Amino acid sequence: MVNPTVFFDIAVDGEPLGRVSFELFADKVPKTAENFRALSTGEKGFGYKGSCFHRIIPGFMCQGGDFTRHNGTGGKSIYGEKFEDENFILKHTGPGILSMANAGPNTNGSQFFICTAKTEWLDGKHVVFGKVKEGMNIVEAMERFGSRNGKTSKKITIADCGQLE
Ligand SMILES: CCOC(=O)CNC(=O)N(Cc1ccc(N)cc1)CC1CC1
């Protein structure tokens, strides 16, 4: 019944910054929600802990989840390397939207992005599966280490992650 909640504890070159928590819309995109949930707990023996936000563009989005190549060329899902676009019921309405990154139709893995602006042109192309619940102020703090081309001026990591009540 109830939508799961996950947290990232963010660090900036090793220094604790704060926590971001997310509602995962399991009621609408269960397969996509379950992937990100599992990768956040690490329960399949791999996932997000210790990985970085490799690409951050202020006034656009923070991208991470590439735990295999650390630079945006990698990652994998709990279902195999890639998995289908589940649906496009949810839209990119504004800051805080959590959505899957991809390389074409039906190429979801582990990489994800947190919107820091409305990104409506991604509607129907990237699967929206969650949203920031607490710690949008921490996402805005992160965003300040990004740049126009998305290279970060400091190393933004998920020092820890998991599932909350
Ligand atoms: C705002 C979200 O932007 C994207 O997902 C744009 N594309 C990527 O980030 N890619 C990187 C990527 C690679 C593998 C996966 N699973 C996801 C993204 C695709 C590159 C051109 C080939």
Scanning the structure block, which residue is given the tokens 């707990």? 41
Please calculate the CA angle 110-104-56 and round it to the nearest 5 degrees: 55
For residue 102, which atom of ligand 1 is closest to its CA?
17
* Resolution to one decimal, Å: 1.9
Q: How far apart are CA 43 and CA 102, in angstroms?
A: 23
Q: Is 75 in the pocket of ligand 1 (CB under 6 A)?
A: yes
Question: Looking at the DSSP assignment, which residues form a beta bridge with residue 8?
Answer: 20, 161
22 closest CA partner among 122, 144, 113 = 113
Direct distance between the N- and C-terminal alpha carbons of the chain, in angstroms, rounded to an integer: 13
Q: What's the DSSP call for residue 2?
A: P
* Angular region, 64: left φ>0, alpha ψ -120 to 50, beta rest: beta
Q: How far apart are CA 140 and CA 18, in angstroms?
A: 11
Residue whose CA is at the smallest distance from ligand 1 atom 17: 102
Tell me the Cα Rg of the chain: 14
Question: Looking at the DSSP assignment, which residues form a beta bridge with residue 130?
Answer: 24, 98
CATH 3.40.640.10 matches 1-165: no
Q: How far apart are CA 88 and CA 74, in angstroms?
A: 23
> Active-site residue among 3, 19, 46, 60?
60
The dihedral over CA atoms of 91, 93, 98, 100, expressed in degrees to the nearest 10, equals 40
34 closest CA partner among 2, 76, 97, 78 = 78
Which strands sit side by side in the sheet containing 112-115, from one edge to the other? Answer: 55-57, 61-64, 112-115, 97-100, 128-134, 15-24, 5-12, 156-164
Query: Residue ranges of the alpha helices (H) in 112-157?
Result: 136-143
Residue 50's contacts (CB-CB under 8 Å, 6 or more residues apart) are: 67, 157, 158, 159
Q: How far apart are CA 74 and CA 147, in angstroms?
A: 21
Residue whose CA is at the smallest distance from ligand 1 atom 4: 101
Residue 104's contacts (CB-CB under 8 Å, 6 or more residues apart) are: none
For residue 119, which atom of ligand 1 is closest to its CA?
1
Residue 148: active-site member: no
Question: Looking at the DSSP assignment, which residues form a beta bridge with residue 157?
Answer: 11, 52
Decide: 13 and 154 in contact? Cβ < 8 Å: yes
Scanning the structure block, which residue is given the tokens 């329960």? 43
Strands 128-134 and 15-24: antiparallel
Q: Is 61 in the pocket of ligand 1 (CB under 6 A)?
A: yes
For residue 109, which atom of ligand 1 is closest to its CA?
16
Domain ranges (residues) in the chain: 1-165
Residue 102 structure tokens:
């991809």
